[PDB]
Amino acid sequence: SMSVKKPKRDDSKDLALCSMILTEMETHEDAWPFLLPVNLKLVPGYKKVIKKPMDFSTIREKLSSGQYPNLETFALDVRLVFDNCETFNEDDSDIGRAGHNMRKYFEKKWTDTFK
Q1: Residues 85, 94: Cα–Cα separation, whole Å
Q2: Could you give the CA distance from residue 107 to residue 102 in angstroms, rounded to a whole number?
Q3: For an engineered disulfide with 14, which of 19, 41, 71, 98 has Cβ 3.0 to 4.6 Å away?
């Protein structure tokens, strides 16, 4: 509250660290369904069903332009990618599996880097 602060967490390496994690996700072999925006002209249903599309290249642009105010708003955008994948794909499909694997991969890097 006013004039009463918790000790300051050093957050000065967060930008660099989210960028590393982002690169590791970009270079994972299962990243393919997620590298680019889902083409909304060519994928029936996506525009209407998925209210907030998100992809790695869009996250990259946002990171690179100071559009994340903090590391949590970064993690939400990455989770949103995998959440969309679940909403639109069956678990028993290559894409649906990729999303599970990529989420498991992200979540380990996030813990090990920050928790």
Answers
A1: 11
A2: 8
A3: 71
The H or E element that residue 45 is part of is none
Contact criterion met (CB below 8 Å) for 60 and 76: no
C-alpha 57/C-alpha 59 separation (Å) is 5
Q: In this structure, what CATH number is given to the domain that contains residue 52?
A: 1.20.920.10
**71, 76, 79: which is closest to 17 by C-alpha?**
71
Q: How many other C-beta atoms lie within 10 A of the C-beta of residue 63?
A: 16
Residue 85 belongs to what H/E stretch? helix 71-88
Taking a C-beta distance cutoff of 8 angstroms, is the pair 32, 98 a contact?
yes
| Number of folded domains that form the chain | 1
Tokens of 41: 């002209």
Write 3-11 long-range contacts (CB < 8 A, 24+). 11/70, 11/71
Determination method here? X-ray
Resolution in Å equals: 2.0
